[PDB]
């Protein structure tokens, strides 16, 4: 792999695609997921690294217990 | 404010608060977006958290972890008012949630767990007594909401008791953890109702 990690493309996109596949013909759910991913991209453009920090803090809460 | 939406408030809100220290705008953008998605499809925030944990190889039970964090982030739930009656409500709420949060550690120690069950019943009684006192003190403001929340609490407490009884037969701990989280959620909803009495 060597070159290139982008928390949004690395973790969020595939996670959200997998989320949709838990219930594929759910229009309202898939729309909700799509809107949220778009807003995460807006936040990431305003503060590079913020998504990574969100995921880290999320994980930390569960590891610490 | 439904049960299924609990993880938004219990897990994500504290994360957003911490992100506010990095960048206020970005944090609020994430906050508003998670709130909107949860409103559109209750249960989504839970699914998202579990999926992210899986992608990061964090091998934990979500229900149990939620319960263990029940005493955390006190400022998100407490009534921010100085009068003794609100302090008393806060303290009764905190005591209940603290005892419940220790179930995952205590449940495998039978002697200790028997004591935990008695401490829970005592803490429930004292919370409900305080709730009724403050309700009367403020002249039955927020009446419909508080009567409904009190009714659901009593229902959830009976259901928690039934779950303990079953646990003594079948040893399936997860069911106790689910039922305990429900009581935590209902405690928080009652606290929230007292935020708007005057």
Curated annotation (Swiss-Prot), chain A:
Highest taxon in the source lineage: Eukaryota
Reported function: Serine/threonine-protein kinase that acts as a mediator of cell growth. Modulates apoptosis. In association with STK24 negatively regulates Golgi reorientation in polarized cell migration upon RHO activation. Phosphorylates ATG4B at 'Ser-383', thereby increasing autophagic flux. Part of the striatin-interacting phosphatase and kinase (STRIPAK) complexes. STRIPAK complexes have critical roles in protein (de)phosphorylation and are regulators of multiple signaling pathways including Hippo, MAPK, nuclear receptor and cytoskeleton remodeling.
Protein name: Serine/threonine-protein kinase 26
Gene that produces this protein: STK26
Parent-record interval covered: 345 to 410 of 416
Cellular compartments annotated: Cytoplasm; Golgi apparatus
Assembly and oligomerization: Homodimer. Interacts with PDCD10. Interacts with GOLGA2. Interacts with CTTNBP2NL. Interacts with RIPOR1 (via C-terminus); this interaction occurs in a PDCD10-dependent and Rho-independent manner. Interacts with PDCD10; this interaction is required for the association of STK26 with RIPOR1. Part of the core of STRIPAK complexes composed of PP2A catalytic and scaffolding subunits, the striatins (PP2A regulatory subunits), the striatin-associated proteins MOB4, STRIP1 and STRIP2, PDCD10 and members of the STE20 kinases, such as STK24 and STK26.
Family: Belongs to the protein kinase superfamily. STE Ser/Thr protein kinase family. STE20 subfamily.
Swiss-Prot record, chain B:
Modified residues (N6-acetyllysine): 165
The UniProt record lists the keyword Ubl conjugation: yes
Family matches, as InterPro entries: PDC10_dimerisation_sf, PDCD10, PDCD10_N
Subcellular location: Cytoplasm; Golgi apparatus membrane; Cell membrane
Any single GO BP term: angiogenesis
Glycyl lysine isopeptide (Lys-Gly) (interchain with G-Cter in SUMO2) crosslink residues: 172
GO-annotated cellular components: cytoplasm; cytosol; extracellular exosome; FAR/SIN/STRIPAK complex; Golgi apparatus; Golgi membrane; plasma membrane
Listed Gene3D superfamilies: 1.10.12.70, Nucleotidyltransferases domain 2
Keywords, ordered alphabetically: Acetylation, Angiogenesis, Apoptosis, Cell membrane, Cytoplasm, Golgi apparatus, Isopeptide bond, Membrane, Ubl conjugation
Topological relation to the membrane, as annotated: Peripheral membrane protein
Origin: domain of life: Eukaryota
Family assignment from sequence similarity: Belongs to the PDCD10 family.
Disease: Cerebral cavernous malformations 3: A form of cerebral cavernous malformations, a congenital vascular anomaly of the central nervous system that can result in hemorrhagic stroke, seizures, recurrent headaches, and focal neurologic deficits. The lesions are characterized by grossly enlarged blood vessels consisting of a single layer of endothelium and without any intervening neural tissue, ranging in diameter from a few millimeters to several centimeters. CCM3 inheritance is autosomal dominant.
Name of the protein: Programmed cell death protein 10
Gene behind the chain: PDCD10
């Amino acid at each position: 792999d060597l070159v290139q990690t982008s928390c949004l493309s690395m973790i969020i996109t595939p996670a959200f695609a997998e989320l949709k596949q838990q219930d594929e013909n759910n229009a309202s759910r898939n729309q909700a997921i799509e809107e949220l991913e778009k807003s995460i991209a807006v936040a990431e453009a305003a503060c590079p690294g913020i998504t990574d920090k969100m995921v880290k803090k999320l994980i930390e809460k569960f590891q610490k217990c | 404010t439904s049960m299924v939406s609990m993880p938004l408030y219990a897990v994500m809100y504290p994360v957003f608060n911490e992100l506010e220290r990095v960048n206020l705008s970005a944090a609020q953008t994430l906050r508003a977006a998670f709130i909107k998605a949860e409103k559109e499809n209750p249960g989504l925030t839970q699914d998202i958290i579990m999926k992210i944990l899986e992608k990061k190889s964090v091998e934990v039970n979500f229900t149990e972890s939620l319960l263990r964090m029940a005493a955390d982030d006190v400022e998100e739930y407490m009534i921010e008012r100085p009068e003794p009656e609100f302090q008393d409500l806060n303290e009764k709420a905190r005591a209940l949630k603290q005892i419940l949060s220790k179930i995952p550690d205590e449940i495998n120690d039978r002697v200790r767990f028997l004591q935990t069950i008695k401490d829970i019943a005592s803490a429930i009684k004292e919370l409900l007594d305080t709730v009724n006192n403050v309700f009367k003190k403020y002249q039955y403001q927020n009446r419909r909401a508080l009567e409904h929340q009190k009714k659901e609490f009593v229902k959830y407490s009976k259901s928690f008791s039934d779950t303990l009884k079953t646990y003594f037969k079948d040893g399936k701990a997860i069911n106790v953890f689910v039922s305990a989280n429900r009581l935590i959620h209902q405690t928080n909803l009652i606290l929230q109702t007292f935020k708007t009495v005057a």
